Design a protein around this ligand. Structure first.
Ligand SMILES: CC(C)=CCC[N@@H+](C)[C@@H]1CC=C(C)CC1
Ligand SMILES: CC(C)=CCC[N@@H+](C)[C@@H]1CC=C(C)CC1
Ligand SMILES: [Mg+2]
Ligand SMILES: [Mg+2]
Ligand SMILES: [Mg+2]
Lengths: 352, 353
């Protein structure tokens, strides 16, 4: 049974400590970027090649795409429309894999030789991601690029490990976070925040590196907390930082949630301490990302947090009320109807 | 000021007890057979004209580096084949050498992905040599382990990039220190290179391997930080290290920073045993031998100067001081080997031929 009571307690503390407040866009801008990113991505995923090598159920691709276009647009508020679109494609390729069930082993036997030789990878996912990667990379300098490349490779290994539905040997205190960094795309996300068009990678090398290092944790932990609801009675998940803290450190689900919350509140505290007296343009990007990322969690269908707002809409219990106020705050800014941007469906473009 | 000899001794002794440091069926003669085999293959590789011209390293430094790495590999990867130790000695010597360059990677990384995707030789000479040699290392492993080596080496490259900035982290940037240490730790490379497919079934042992990688990453780097603490204590050239970065980033004292490292190191040690004690025998043995050899390597290799500590507490009636000396003599007994017995001829001589 889902610990609704604690779920509220934990989420509320987080939203209050960070003083959640999304002011990233005017409703017209939001809609304008959502459509742009979706349109370029939709046309991309509708091509016969992408349609045939990417093994995904149409209704699932469509949902994944709209979920990512939101994530990108809602959290990368300061980058260009082109950048948002190209990033939306990359992170859609990753989300599709994130929910998948496949054995990479057979198609990874000649990974390095094919890579070094320039031959197309045998694993369809890599074939599509690597072929499209330059469209994402043209937006960044060499350092950030390397970070995106590494993180995507890490993420791939992370989905691989998860295929074994293994949560760690009891007593393996390092396994939980080892896996979370693997599947976190932390460095990919943190480095994709600095397009060379807006930032000089050599002038801000230290601030960017720091942002990557620190934002990696804040970023993953926030999702571990916000996405705790959709992940639970879900088979594909189960193997999560929270539930692995349970199996590996042999503690109660209750203690795992509290542990995660303290890490996050701490990660949040230091984000502020370090990036307050720094380059304004840098702070702005971090700020927009942090608040926007939270708005996306409270709004997007993938996380089904409305199924908790409705089942807690009543009953006054301090947390329950504080949660619904936040849920509404975000709902008022990012609860944009799909029919206003996510059109036409990918399936329709594919069969044109 | 003044090295915490007491605290240091206690921590090391506890470390060696927690891991069950003890004698092994690995002799001195076998070590010498392995040392010379790995050294000989590596020396011939680095003495080739191509390697000699793309790897801008001072010859004496290359010579000393190769000898440090061969020792590390032959002593810690005790269960793998001679070829495997040899090929890993080459890879790890390449990585250790990358630290000798100040040259900004930026200009050479502008087209990293495009050259990689197209199959054109990388612009950064280091990658050119390393990627060209990698298959010799990879043939010894399954696809999963391979991927780990590849990632960790890519991580290591970025780590060296970052280190060129001599940056210990902004005060209050608590996550910076460990983020950096993992970056250039090679943990996943090390951890996964302990399971040759010839001796292990990556698929059947997937869970124990993934677990060893996870736990070995932190053990391997923290033990090195701990044992390197003496050699880096007064060294004003070494300005950024996990411990010094904890000081700058967390805003605590060198002492408190050392305490943090100790607690992590010791804790990591207990869980290593507590997790692999009952698991598969061949696996626990590889893990068991890695920890012991890794420690022996530190105690015997002169780069860490631990003999200076041994030679200073050699005659004190303290308990720790004695257990330390005892341990050290166990190490020296089986590991203190003269380079003239295996490391010959010098790479330079092979180069002129
Ligand atoms: C998007 C996918 C495929 C997986 C979720 C992994 N998380 C670590 C997120 C990755 C993207 C952002 C913006 C934040 C953290
Ligand atoms: C080899 C030395 C000097 C120290 C041990 C620390 N590890 C993190 C090493 C980093 C570089 C290599 C090649 C292997 C592992
Ligand atoms: Mg995932
Ligand atoms: Mg998931
Ligand atoms: Mg999640």
């Amino acid at each position: 049974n889902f610990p609704t009571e604690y779920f509220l307690n934990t989420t509320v503390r987080l939203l209050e400590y960070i003083r959640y407040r999304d002011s990233n866009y005017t409703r017209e801008e939001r809609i304008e970027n959502l459509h742009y990113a979706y349109n370029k991505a939709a046309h991309h995923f509708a091509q016969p090649r992408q349609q045939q090598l990417l093994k995904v159920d149409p209704k699932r691709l469509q949902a994944s795409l709209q979920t990512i276009v939101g994530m990108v647009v809602y959290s990368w508020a300061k980058v260009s429309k082109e950048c948002m679109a190209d990033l939306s494609i990359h992170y859609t390729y990753t989300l599709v894999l994130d929910d998948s069930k496949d054995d990479p082993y057979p198609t990874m036997v000649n990974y390095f030789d094919d890579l070094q030789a320039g031959r197309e990878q045998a694993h369809p996912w890599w074939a599509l991601v690597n072929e499209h990667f330059p469209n994402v990379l043209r937006h960044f300098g060499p350092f950030c690029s390397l970070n995106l490349i590494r993180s995507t490779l890490d993420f791939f290994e992370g989905c691989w490990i998860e295929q074994y539905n293994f949560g760690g040997f009891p007593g393996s205190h390092d396994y939980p976070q080892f896996l979370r960094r693997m599947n976190g795309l932390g460095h990919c996300v943190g480095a994709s925040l600095w397009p060379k068009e807006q930032f000089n990678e050599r002038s801000l090398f230290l601030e960017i590196t720091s942002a990557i290092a620190q934002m990696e944790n804040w970023m993953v932990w926030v999702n571990d907390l916000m996405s705790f609801y959709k992940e639970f009675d879900d088979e594909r998940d189960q193997i999560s930082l929270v539930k692995n803290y349970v199996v590996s450190d042999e503690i109660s689900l209750h203690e795992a949630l509290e542990k995660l919350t303290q890490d996050t509140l701490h990660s949040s505290k230091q984000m502020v301490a370090v990036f307050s007296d720094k380059d304004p343009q840098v702070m702005d990007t971090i700020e927009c990302f942090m608040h926007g990322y939270v708005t996306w969690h409270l709004c997007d269908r993938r996380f089904r947090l409305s199924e908790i707002y409705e089942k807690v809409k009543e009953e006054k219990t301090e947390d329950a009320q504080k949660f619904c106020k936040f849920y509404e705050q975000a709902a008022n800014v990012g609860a944009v109807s799909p029919s206003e941007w996510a059109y036409p469906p990918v399936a329709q473009l594919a069969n044109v």
